[PDB]
């Protein structure tokens, strides 16, 4: 009974694909490369709803000319099971059928096929088709073709990562990134930089990742998703190194820029890293994020870790670490947690500084459960130099005195903040006025 | 002006028994057993034994099930007689009686289904609201949060469609009790104050208990001016409090800044709230918030203060006040800093201009984030 | 009760008396406008669904 529903679903999917290729052709004809992004938008939904009949009919109807790619593609696809009501979907008519299809359209269809092959647990042929597509893209040179090649790069890297051959694709990615940078392609630059950072971080080549980040300038006109990926990876690098403040800033920006509804796993990962880096810095993460339905069960070990850090107790911390030791390793924060396990006292010193305007070193030792006040003095001096606490020590009497709070308003800082925001708003208005189209003269 | 069904004192007694301290309360056990004996609650007795690991007095339960079956068959026969000839009215009353007895015996699901069928047949808005109130009271008795929320929304929709203001005020009291349950003390105090002069829901609690609850919620939800104009200067509240020396002392200690007496009153109120079933979940949050409120009230009129003076005012030691102030300043509640070498409590209340600048930065950053996201999404 | 604008300095046995413009009435209006325009941007978000 569901066969008829599947067939009508396939027909509507074919209509959607035809609309997509029409949009690509319109983009190429009108010299408006950004149009192809409209078709590329529905890539996840189309991948979800793809089927054998859909792919076979699409390729047959869209590869009348240049049948070499049909020869390379069809064998991977499965023949329809004795189809008798075939309508012989023929989108290209007469002159259109005779003429060779466009490079962007061929790339899009190849991309659909590789995505389907990947979704199915058959990665070898996915890699083969991907390599063929990449050869085609390298041979060609166009703008809309580059826009499609961005997603092609993403899925090529994905299939190789599934294969566990991420290292070999590194040189391929570097070469393509160089070509894109020479050709001034922001989308390709962003996608390739994100994929390269992922490659490095997979094998823990943090020095290489840092060098590439320092020497490459991320495109400003990049999609919010690419910005989120880049911010997350840079924050990961800075957190693995000792740049906790910058890591927290960048990763808050990444979580802010991530899509609101989807990207649940990315949100969980960024949230865990943010919790750990905040604990290292000595603050206390907000508790609202610990009860969201999506991020509820995942962050429980980190909830317990925050509990122990706040009520600093090495017994509880070690218990939590021993219990959830393996999950920290799986999620990629065990080393940072190990650092926290020894810099825990920083949080206590921060709370003491926040509460007390002037306290004795003996009292600080008593509150921090330390040994003789010499250790407390050394810890406080370390914190002051690190900038965690704005206080000055005075041993001629033997107390730590917190610095005064300066009147920020009388300073020029509000002027700078407001100027930044004014410039941002003016740029937004200018670009929103330039985005307008008046089409009747077409 | 509504039936005492389900009897919420039963829920109170069950909670008292569930509490570890009073699980051996012979008197409470006798009172609960007497109530269940009189009302013939076989499902509730079964559930209570299952939950408390109590021996089943099968001798009583036998006759009790006998009476329950007798009454149920009577009600079914009367319903059948009604539907045979009588048109409406009598059949609705039959279903109401059946469901009421089922609730009185304790069958949650049977009672809920009976009330749903009765509501489906009923067309009078008053009777519909009465059914919704019965369901809301069952949800309160069994702390069924989803049922409570759904029935509250249904009652609100009915009142919007049109209904008596008496039922409106009753719904206000019900909403207030639910708000106290889910820790929305601001709305609880608002509704209780609005209904202090229009209280007709004696089905849920006594008027003295209602005024005590209103006082408790008000002193935590209302600033000093509102507490002055509404609670302390409230004629009805004062009239009722005239018979409650403890609650009057608790309120007036805070109002008049007699802090030792206020701390004593909060100490007794903590035990009262912990024993009370509605407040028991939030019996520490309320105490902590009241302590923070008292400390902030004392500090609101002092640039500098001495820990010895604070300890004398609160009738405590210096170390206790030091711990409390440190904890609350760290949590960010009290605006002050503690100087220990010289025991001073210098106040650090923020400047309005600077607070406004920070708030503007934060809110404008959120808005600009959203505007940038919209601009980006417009083209992609 | 805000009868007079002043603050007590215990220990030193002093009473400080000052005059304060506690509020600007421009920052508050700006904040309210920011909230209202946040609502407007939410409505624009809803309206942009037609573009998709």
């Amino acid at each position: 009974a569901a066969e008829h529903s599947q067939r009508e679903l396939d027909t509507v999917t074919l209509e959607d694909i035809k609309e997509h290729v029409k949009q690509l052709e319109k983009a190429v004809s009108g010299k408006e490369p950004r149009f192809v992004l409209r078709a590329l938008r529905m890539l996840p939904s189309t991948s979800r709803r793809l089927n054998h009949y859909v792919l076979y009919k699409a390729v047959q109807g869209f590869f009348t000319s240049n049948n070499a790619t049909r020869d390379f593609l069809l064998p991977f696809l499965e023949e329809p099971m004795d189809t008798e009501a075939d309508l012989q979907f023929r989108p290209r008519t007469g002159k259109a059928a005779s003429t060779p299809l466009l490079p962007e359209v061929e790339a899009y269809l190849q991309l659909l096929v590789v995505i389907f092959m990947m979704n199915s647990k058959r990665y070898k042929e996915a890699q083969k088709i991907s390599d063929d597509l990449m050869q085609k893209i390298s041979t060609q040179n166009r703008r809309a073709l580059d826009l499609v090649a961005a997603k092609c790069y993403y899925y090529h890297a994905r299939v190789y990562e599934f294969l566990d051959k991420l290292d070999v694709v590194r040189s391929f990615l570097h070469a393509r990134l160089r070509t894109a940078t020479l050709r001034h392609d922001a989308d390709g630059q962003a996608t390739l930089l994100n994929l390269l950072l992922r490659n490095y971080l997979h094998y823990s080549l943090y020095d290489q990742a840092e060098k590439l980040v320092s020497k490459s300038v991320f495109p400003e006109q990049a999609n919010n998703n690419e910005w989120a990926r880049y911010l997350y990876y840079t924050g990961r690098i800075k957190a693995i190194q000792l740049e906790y403040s910058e890591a927290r800033r960048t990763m808050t920006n990444a979580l802010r820029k991530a899509p609101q509804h989807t990207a649940v796993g990315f949100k969980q990962t960024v949230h865990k890293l943010l919790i750990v880096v905040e604990l290292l810095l000595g603050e206390i993460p907000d508790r609202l994020q610990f009860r969201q339905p999506s991020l509820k069960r995942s962050l429980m070990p980190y909830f317990l870790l925050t509990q122990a850090v706040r009520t600093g107790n090495l017994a509880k911390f070690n218990q939590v670490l021993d219990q959830f030791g393996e999950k920290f390793q799986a999620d990629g924060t065990y080393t940072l947690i190990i650092r926290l396990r020894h810099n825990v006292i920083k949080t206590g010193v921060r709370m003491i500084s926040l509460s007390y305007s002037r306290i004795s070193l003996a009292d600080i030792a008593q509150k921090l459960q330390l040994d003789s006040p010499e250790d407390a003095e050394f810890i406080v001096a370390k914190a002051i130099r690190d900038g965690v606490i704005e206080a000055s020590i005075n041993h001629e009497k033997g107390y730590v005195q917190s610095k005064e709070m300066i009147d920020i308003y009388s300073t020029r800082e509000p002027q700078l903040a407001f100027h930044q925001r004014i410039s941002f708003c003016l740029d937004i208005h200018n670009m929103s006025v330039k985005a307008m189209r008046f089409p009747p003269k077409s | 002006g509504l039936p005492k069904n389900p009897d919420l004192r039963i829920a109170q007694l069950r909670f008292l028994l569930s509490l570890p301290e009073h699980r051996g309360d012979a008197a409470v056990r006798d009172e609960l057993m007497a109530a269940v004996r009189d009302n013939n609650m076989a499902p509730y007795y079964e559930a209570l034994c299952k939950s408390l690991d109590w021996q089943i007095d099968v001798d009583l339960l036998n006759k009790m099930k006998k009476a329950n079956e007798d009454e149920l068959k009577r009600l079914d026969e009367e319903l059948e007689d009604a539907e045979k000839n009588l048109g409406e009215s009598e059949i609705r009353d039959a279903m109401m009686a059946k469901a009421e007895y089922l609730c009185r015996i304790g069958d949650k699901e049977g009672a809920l289904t009976a009330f749903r069928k009765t509501y489906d047949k009923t067309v009078a808005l008053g009777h519909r609201l009465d059914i919704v109130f019965y369901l809301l009271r069952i949800g309160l008795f069994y702390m069924d949060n989803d049922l409570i929320t759904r029935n509250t929304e249904k009652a609100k929709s009915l009142i919007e469609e049109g209904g008596d203001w008496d039922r409106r005020n009753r719904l206000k009291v019900y909403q207030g009790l639910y708000c106290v349950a889910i820790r929305d003390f601001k709305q609880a105090a608002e509704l209780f104050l609005d209904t202090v002069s229009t209280f007709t829901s004696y089905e849920l609690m006594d008027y003295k208990t209602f005024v005590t609850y209103t006082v408790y919620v008000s002193m935590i939800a209302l600033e000093r001016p509102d507490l002055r104009e509404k609670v302390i200067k409230g004629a009805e509240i004062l009239e009722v409090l005239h018979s409650l020396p403890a609650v009057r002392q608790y309120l007036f200690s805070l109002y008049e800044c007699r802090y030792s007496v206020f701390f004593q009153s909060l100490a007794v109120v903590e035990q009262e709230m912990k024993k009370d079933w509605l407040f028991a979940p939030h019996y520490r949050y309320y105490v902590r918030e009241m302590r923070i409120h008292a400390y902030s009230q004392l500090l609101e009129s002092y640039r500098s203060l001495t820990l010895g003076y604070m300890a004398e005012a609160f009738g405590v030691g210096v170390e206790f006040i030091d711990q409390e102030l440190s904890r609350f300043i760290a949590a960010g509640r009290l605006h002050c800093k503690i100087d220990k070498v010289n025991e001073i409590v210098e106040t650090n209340r923020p400047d309005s201009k600077n607070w406004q600048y920070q708030e503007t930065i934060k809110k404008g950053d959120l808005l600009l984030n959203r505007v940038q996201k919209l601009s980006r999404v417009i083209n992609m | 009760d805000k009868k007079f604008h002043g603050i007590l300095d215990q220990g030193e046995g002093v009473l400080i008396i000052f005059d304060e413009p506690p509020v600007d009435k421009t920052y508050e209006a700006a904040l309210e406008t920011i909230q209202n325009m946040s609502k407007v941007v939410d409505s624009l978000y809803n309206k942009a669904k037609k573009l998709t």
Binding site: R421, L426, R437 | L374 | -
Partner: peptide, 30 residues
């Protein structure tokens, strides 16, 4: 800054309206 924010929101509103109009016109012509 508040004035500039108002200006930006108005510009976004105009862009959304223009895009709606163009998309509707293209759909009708198609």
């Amino acid at each position: 800054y508040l004035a500039s924010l108002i200006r930006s929101v108005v510009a976004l509103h105009n862009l959304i309206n223009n895009k709606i109009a163009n998309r509707d016109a293209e759909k009708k012509e198609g």
